[PDB]
């Protein structure tokens, strides 16, 4: 429901 704005930094 959330996008890789779950702060994907990897």
């Amino acid at each position, epitope marked *: *429901g*959330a996008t*890789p*704005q*779950d*702060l*994907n*930094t*990897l």
Partner: antibody
Amino acid sequence: QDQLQQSGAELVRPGASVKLSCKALGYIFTDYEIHWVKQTPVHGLEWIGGIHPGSSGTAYNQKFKGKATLTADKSSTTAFMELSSLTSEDSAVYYCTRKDYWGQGTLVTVSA
Amino acid sequence: DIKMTQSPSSMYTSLGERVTITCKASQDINSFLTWFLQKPGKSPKTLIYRANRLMIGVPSRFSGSGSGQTYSLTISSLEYEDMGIYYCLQYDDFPLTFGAGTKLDLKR
């Protein structure tokens, strides 16, 4: 979107190893990082590390680097966490999280 | 290591009351913060993510706010099912760090 499913409660002897598993369901497994977190009454909640199943990139807390090994299997959409040389201090609940979703946790009891 | 200072640490509240829990980060975390609740013998349930996004299925009581260093979670009218420990989680940078928790008790 759906969820994380963790492997069952584990009962190991001092100095052994455990491999915990975390199955991702209902979402594109390769677009999100999977993180492992440890919880004990003493220390509270602590981050171990995480993997990005797309790129394979990993990151670890300096305290678990050398003890914890993180791997991911794309065909089974399962993230794994290996723990070596266990002592009673490793006795805890282990959780995999997507940061928004949490697995249910696996209890690892280290005892003789 | 970013440090999260959650407060208060335990609160004595009433059913139907409006509660406010806070998290200060030792530096700026760009709204990368989650709020989750854990009940006794139970896995964490995230309520809010990216500082103020409700999670599918969470009552609209719950509401997050802040920017920079000071974040908040407000529970507009406490219900019995809300009782447990609340935590904030910063995911701006590694290592991930958590507040120490906020325990809610019905006063009497």
